[PDB]
Ligand binder design. Structure first.
Ligand SMILES: S=c1[nH]nc(-c2cccnc2)n1C[C@@H]1CCCO1
Ligand SMILES: [Ca+2]
Ligand SMILES: [Ca+2]
Ligand SMILES: [Zn+2]
Ligand SMILES: [Zn+2]
Length: 229
């Protein structure tokens, strides 16, 4: 049921939701998948995360034009690392309004990423301040606290069973929390737990580097993170 367009793979998760997957061949690891989301919101499309590269990101947009044929209104990118923000220039060239955590945009230059056009800010309880996320339709943006990076954010899709943990959440059989080069090992477990509590009825948990899982991914990630303190 999965579809290939250029270097990208797409999988439909729900009537109005698809996962996009892009690959980069890394020293040491070889080919590494990274996943984001595409959401049809009535007459428009919303994107979560770029692909690794601008070329791959343009392939997402072309697949959307071909298969969905609705304007892409905006994209939310989930932290300032290549897998999630590598394709910003491609979104900007296509005229898609981009949104990231303020902190992602502040870190972006140091991390070699291009900042988004707009900054999301968050309350103490993690929820986006709504004036910063105008007309986000079903996307509910949550900052769960520092974990994979200090700026990692997460998104739930209202009206669906789906929530996206990005690179904070690992699958429920994972052996480790993977890339911890920029991680907050002290607060990781609470941040994983906070994402779970923010989206308490999501049953399909989508994440950057494994296929969609159940809520078990959340509790497994938190259990692994507990051992880093
Ligand atoms: S996660 C996360 N954050 N940054 C990156 C990344 C890594 C290497 C180069 N550019 C970005 N990754 C993904 C990989 C996945 C497993 C190893 O790290
Ligand atoms: Ca670029
Ligand atoms: Ca870094
Ligand atoms: Zn990262
Ligand atoms: Zn990642």
């Amino acid at each position: 049921g999965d579809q290939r367009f250029g270097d990208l793979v797409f999988r439909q998760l729900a009537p109005n939701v698809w996962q996009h997957t892009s690959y980069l061949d890394m020293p040491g690891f070889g080919a590494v998948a990274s996943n984001g989301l595409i959401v049809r919101d009535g007459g428009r499309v919303l994107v979560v995360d770029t692909a690794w590269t601008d070329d791959q990101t343009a392939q997402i947009l072309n697949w959307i034009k071909q298969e969905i044929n609705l304007p892409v209104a905006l994209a939310v990118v989930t932290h300032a690392h290549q897998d999630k923000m590598g394709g910003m220039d491609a979104l900007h060239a296509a005229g898609i309004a981009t949104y990231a955590n303020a902190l992602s945009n502040q870190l972006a230059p140091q991390e070699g990423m291009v900042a988004a056009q707009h900054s999301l800010t968050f309350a103490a309880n993690g929820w986006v301040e709504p004036a910063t996320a105008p007309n986000f339709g079903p996307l509910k943006v949550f900052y769960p606290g520092p974990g994979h990076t200090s700026d990692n954010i997460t998104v739930g899709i209202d009206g669906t069973d789906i929530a996206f943990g990005g690179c904070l959440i690992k699958d429920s059989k994972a052996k480790s929390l993977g890339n911890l080069g920029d991680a907050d090992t002290e607060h990781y477990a609470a941040s994983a737990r906070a994402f779970g509590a923010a989206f308490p009825k999501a049953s399909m948990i989508v994440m950057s580097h494994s296929a969609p899982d159940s809520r078990a991914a959340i509790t497994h990630t938190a259990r692994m993170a507990d051992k880093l303190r």
